[PDB]
Structure 1
């Protein structure tokens, strides 16, 4: 079952892993935010709200194999707040839908 909204984390991300995420097209998303957190072991904290419904395999293809991804929960704005809670954003793109 594909869903539209995914959350995801990446502990200790490589720079090639950072560029894979930033190299995504702006059109993939209604809303996209990934903050950097932690620097005793920095992890990425990301929430993606895709335009189309996406499948696990497709969310992993886009973000990276090493990401831990699962269906998101809560309002768009709620996860925006969760992802920008250490105040070091890497990517924001779009606007939070309902």
Structure 2
């Protein structure tokens, strides 16, 4: 299996989020047991405040380096849906905490800069 990568259309970034429905103890443990040094910022939150329904995983991780969607799947796995994050450090940190339940708290408050 050979694949070609470059800078066409979508490009790699230092910010990627992950979301999976009805997360298992194994999957949640894997991501929660991930290398903190690998991501300057790591924030995971659990969302499950509805009886009769299963829990859901929702968190954000800032890649210390530049990685692509397909590549990032090497850690976040294909099982869990990943997407590009947007906003400031508080926007991402608060967004994950919006669930009211924290699954993992590590890394530093990575914010954007441009002005």
- Who wins on radius of gyration, i.e. which is larger? 2
Query: Are 2:47 and 1:37 equivalent residues in the alignment?
Result: yes
* 4+ runs deviating over 4 angstroms: none
Gap runs ≥5 in structure 2 = 1-10
Structure with the greater relative contact order (CA < 8 A, sep ≥ 6): 1 or 2?
1
Cα distance, 1:78 vs structure 2: 0.2
Measure, in 1, the Cα distance between the counterparts of 2:28 and 2:13.
Answer: 24
- Tell me the TM-score normalized by structure 1: 0.90
Shift of 1:33: 0.6
CA RMSD after TM alignment: 1.4
CA offsets 1:13-44 (integer angstroms, 9 cap, x no match): 11111121022111111111110002622111
Determine if contact 2:58/2:96 at 8 Å carries over to the other structure.
yes
Q: Which has the higher strand share?
A: 1
Between 53-62 and 26-35, the greater mean CA deviation after superposition: 53-62
Report the count of equivalent residues.
98
Task: Return the alpha-carbon distance in structure 2 between the equivalents of residues 77 and 54 of structure 1.
Answer: 22
Where structure 1 has 5 or more consecutive residues not aligned to the other structure, the ranges are: none
